[PDB]
Assembly symmetry: C3
Homo-oligomer: 222 residues x 3
């Protein structure tokens, strides 16, 4: 299509789809109940992403939002994806360290607020207010990163993989509010095609890279 | 109303409503925790359907989608219903065979993708792309039917009822992508009033017929 | 803003936000798994409300609905809030009395129907039909209040707090259908600024007042 960002959407669609099939094939025959949980979640997440990348590529998950007296192309389909895939990724971490239910509920809830307020900010027509939603969303993220960092005698296999995945999460998830802030949803200092490229690298890493790391460890088996 | 399909929407509303009250009255006094689970789920599903059938009948859950240079009446309220009722129906099956959590998550997730992509296809304005979403949705269905068929020492009561309900599911759920494909959302070979009739027969059978079968068995009691 | 109701939206935003921070600080250091559950839920609920009150205050969660040949300002963001916060409040009650899963599913499901049909009624352009949805929603509420009242050897600490919270719920939740009926969504006998004031008092009481009562009791600790 005309959209210069189409290539990264196409590339993203392809990588999420290939990752989904890879994880699909890999989890064939798994019988341990616990490992079954992890395979399901690490397969499901890129499958969801695949469908939302495809909707962006085909133009379905795109809308125009007026602000700054301009018509800004806003890919809303990303929030539909993240609404489901970021709590699932947090579930991966929680199952790992066998987090208490109370804590899981806190994380999932903070995470819904994070994506929900990001969506509202993405769709808000008063320019100044967009950043108010960005700030509240960011606070929710910080809450999450805090709990993953200061809320957690587990087998050394668990601890070792958790620490890695936890560091991956903090680094990758922290870049999203920055990309949004500088990209077309925020200050618009970075054009949409480079922003889409950034999100594509982050998403594949956060979903497929993260899943490859998770599924290579024995911490997932009972 | 003018809509020739109104009669099947009215009939559907009436049957889902009557079924809901029947199951409501039937589950009065149930005290076994396990049977309590099944009654809740088989009552809830037609109650949801009732509300979405009523919204279609009153015109609320209907929208026009441009494609093929025409204005196509698309009942979106069906996906709102199915989004909640098809995972609940799969939960009925999973509780039955006491499925592992990992597997339940896989089914619910595949099922959300199934209905979500069906909705996107239903609302897509580029005619060709509608069938791409139909295909992805169909693949998700096939995944589900596979797991219900090849992923499952349970009491012979369980196995016997499961097998019946499993065969009911495969037969009825498999007809939906065909109806959509030939009906107004797809190729438009079948007019909307006959399509609405088809979906009404499928839905009542899949919800009320299925629930009557489930609740007649002793497999639901501990 | 011009909207006379802005003050109650501002006040509501402020009270939900202050309550969220209060509960946030209060649950610091909690380590009992059970109490952890309650803190999460009573903190999450006002945090959600905060974001939806802010969206109403900034104008995002407001839409105009034609009916009675007028353009009626409808705050849809309330249903987005209630969709998540009313089942969470019911979860508080269920955890308390250690309700069976079957029953929890029934309550959450009835509750989704309650808010979902209230939303449909809120957005319905045929005046007469709005009250049909109000009636179905009200029936769902009555179902819920029934189960909380007639569906429940627990420690006397549990029973004592449950009874209080149960009476709070019945009184406060019962006022919502009345406010809606007499307010701008229904008969329009009460102007929108007084209606917003009513909902603000109900919401803070149902979320912050309710949470303060819940967290003062020892029934929440194992
Ligand atoms: C829990 C725990 C935490 C709860 C967090 C509280 C915050 C909730 C706020 C939410 C509000 C949603 C806003 C949106 C639905 C309203 C759509 O209106 C748009 C903006 O006026 C219209 O623009 C154009 C429309 C654009 C399209 C938007 C699509 C989006 C939908 C993504 C959700 C998915 C649902 C899966 C459906 C199948
Ligand atoms: C934000 C706080 C941290 C949290 C509290 C939330 C409330 C405050 C929201 C931020 C807010 C004002 C930013 C206002 C930008 C302001 C310079 C707009 C100036 O007017 C310009 C011309 O009329 C807008 O045109 C368009 C010019 C654009 C190119 C300028 C982009 C604006 C930038 C805003 C960046 C805010 C991020 C720092 C916050 C980083 C922390
Ligand atoms: C943007 C990327 C960083 C690019 C830099 C290239 C790699 C840099 C790695 C960053 C980090 C990884 C550090 C290694 C880790 C190892 C820590 O293990 C510790 C042992 O208990 C864990 O506790 C304590 C762990 C502590 C670790 C906290 C991680 C830091 C978080 C980095 C912020 C994020 C990125 C900010 C966004 C930016 C891209 C705009
Ligand atoms: C999980 C696990 C799996 C996740 C699956 C990934 C796929 C997610 C895709 C979803 C995207 C939803 C699309 C839709 C919300 C966007 C609405 O915009 C329409 C099409 O441009 C506008 O046309 C006219 C609008 C029409 C109205 C559409 C209504 C529908 C809403 C049904 C959902 C219900 C929510 C209950 C609310 C109370
Ligand atoms: C589909 C694959 C199995 C999965 C891969 C998904 C990508 C392919 C999507 C299918 C796609 C082209 C079908 C294209 C229909 C094509 C004949 C359109 C021809 O142009 C016509 C006039 O311009 C369209 O008018 C309107 C004419 C309409 C009356 C014709 C209806 C089209 C039919 C499409 C049927 C596809 C189903 C076979 C797939 C069954 C498997
Ligand atoms: C089989 C596997 C996917 C097949 C790959 C094909 C990709 C299509 O190539 C281009 C046409 O030359 C797509 O642009 C054509 C313009 C449009 C783009 C459509 C390409 C995507 C719709 C295809 C993405 C995967 C599809 C998924 C079909 C369902 C799946 C379950 C088999
Ligand atoms: C459209 C309907 C079929 C109308 C036909 C009228 C009744 C036909 C029954 C279809 C089927 C039922 C067969 C009986 C079953 C009994 C199988 O029990 C087996 C014992 O282990 C289960 O394992 C193995 C079980 C295997 C059974 C697989 C079921 C088949 C699936 C049928 C496809 C669907 C319908 C295709 C849609 C069509 C309507 C366009
Ligand atoms: C379960 C168990 C029980 C299921 C209950 C069955 C009843 C389900 C019905 C639901 C249907 C939702 C209606 C709505 C999504 C359709 C939007 O269209 C509006 C009315 O035509 C357009 O007006 C203007 C649009 C207005 C905006 C509406 C926003 C609302 C969205 C609130 C949901 C939130 C989702 C969190 C997203 C992040
Ligand atoms: C409702 C039953 C209990 C449950 C069954 C649901 C189906 C019935 C829905 C109620 C319905 C007719 C109410 C119809 C109101 C009727 C007086 C409208 C008269 O026409 C007026 C001028 O054309 C409407 O203008 C506007 C005039 C407005 C100011 C009048 C407001 C209408 C009021 C409706 C109140 C219904 C509540 C009693 C139900 C309390 C129980
Ligand atoms: C009591 C039970 C339902 C009563 C049945 C009545 C059905 C209405 O008959 C027709 C008027 O002659 C409806 O068309 C009138 C035009 C419009 C159609 C409205 C009919 C539906 C709105 C009624 C469907 C059931 C209602 C649910 C009221 C709430 C329920 C919880 C009691
Ligand atoms: C509108 C408010 C009531 C304003 C009135 C000011 C305080 C009045 C309190 C109302 C009620 C509280 C009664 C005390 C309670 C104590 C009951 O304890 C019992 C011991 O087992 C619980 O079983 C049995 C418990 C039984 C209690 C049922 C509660 C009643 C429900 C009241 C209806 C609601 C309000 C109707 C809405 C109105 C505002 C339009
Ligand atoms: C066999 C294994 C290792 C995995 C196969 C699954 C295939 C799909 C995608 C593989 C790539 C992901 C690796 C994670 C890390 C990265 C930072 C990815 C950034 C993406 C950019 C494009 C790079 C090239 C690729 C096409 C693999
Ligand atoms: C007492 C029992 C058996 C159930 C009572 C609940 C009432 C509601 C609906 C009953 C019908 C459902 C039977 C399932 C099978 C079918 C294939 C249904 C197809 C629907 C078409 C209309 C048929 C007539 C009816 C009004 C029952
Ligand atoms: C320290 C404790 C008690 C709580 C602090 C949290 C602060 C936030 C809100 C506190 C108010 C809620 C009490 C519940 C009961 C009421 C009926 C509230 C009705 C609201 C109307 C405004 C009243 C004044 C207030 C600003 C507290
Ligand atoms: C699968 C993709 C992942 C892991 C996406 C993560 C996304 C975030 C952490 C997004 C965060 C945001 C905020 C903190 C600020 C507002 C905007 C968002 C939604 C981009
Ligand atoms: C309560 C009703 C039930 C059991 C509905 C089942 C619906 C399906 C299995 C729908 C499947 C679809 C696809 C496989 C293809 C695309 C279109 C759908 C959504 C009709
Ligand atoms: C956090 C706020 C709470 C506890 C809100 C409770 C809301 C209700 C009980 C709403 C009920 C409604 C009906 C019974 C009738 C139709 C309209 C509603 C949605 C206001």
């Amino acid at each position: 299509t005309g959209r210069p960002e189409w290539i990264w959407l196409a590339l993203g669609t392809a990588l999420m789809g290939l990752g989904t099939l890879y994880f699909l094939v890999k989890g064939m025959g798994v019988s341990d109940p616990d490992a079954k949980k992890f395979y399901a979640i690490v397969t499901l997440v890129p499958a969801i992403a695949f469908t939302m990348y495809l909707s962006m590529l085909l133009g379905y998950g795109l809308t125009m939002v007026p602000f700054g007296g301009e018509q800004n192309p806003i890919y809303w389909a990303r929030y539909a994806d993240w609404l489901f895939t970021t709590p699932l990724l947090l579930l991966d971490l929680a199952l790992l360290v066998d987090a208490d239910q109370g804590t899981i509920l806190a994380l999932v809830g903070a995470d819904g607020i994070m994506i929900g307020t990001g969506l509202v900010g993405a769709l808000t027509k008063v320019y100044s207010y967009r950043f108010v939603w960005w700030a509240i969303s960011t606070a929710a993220m910080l809450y999450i990163l805090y709990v993953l960092f200061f809320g957690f005698s587990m087998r050394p296999e668990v601890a070792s993989t958790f620490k890695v995945l936890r560091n991956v999460t903090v680094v990758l998830w922290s870049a999203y509010p920055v990309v949004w802030l500088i990209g077309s949803e925020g200050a618009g200092i970075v054009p949409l095609n480079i922003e889409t490229l950034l999100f594509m690298v982050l998403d594949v890493s956060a979903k497929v890279g993260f899943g490859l790391i998770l599924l290579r460890s024995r911490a997932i088996f009972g």
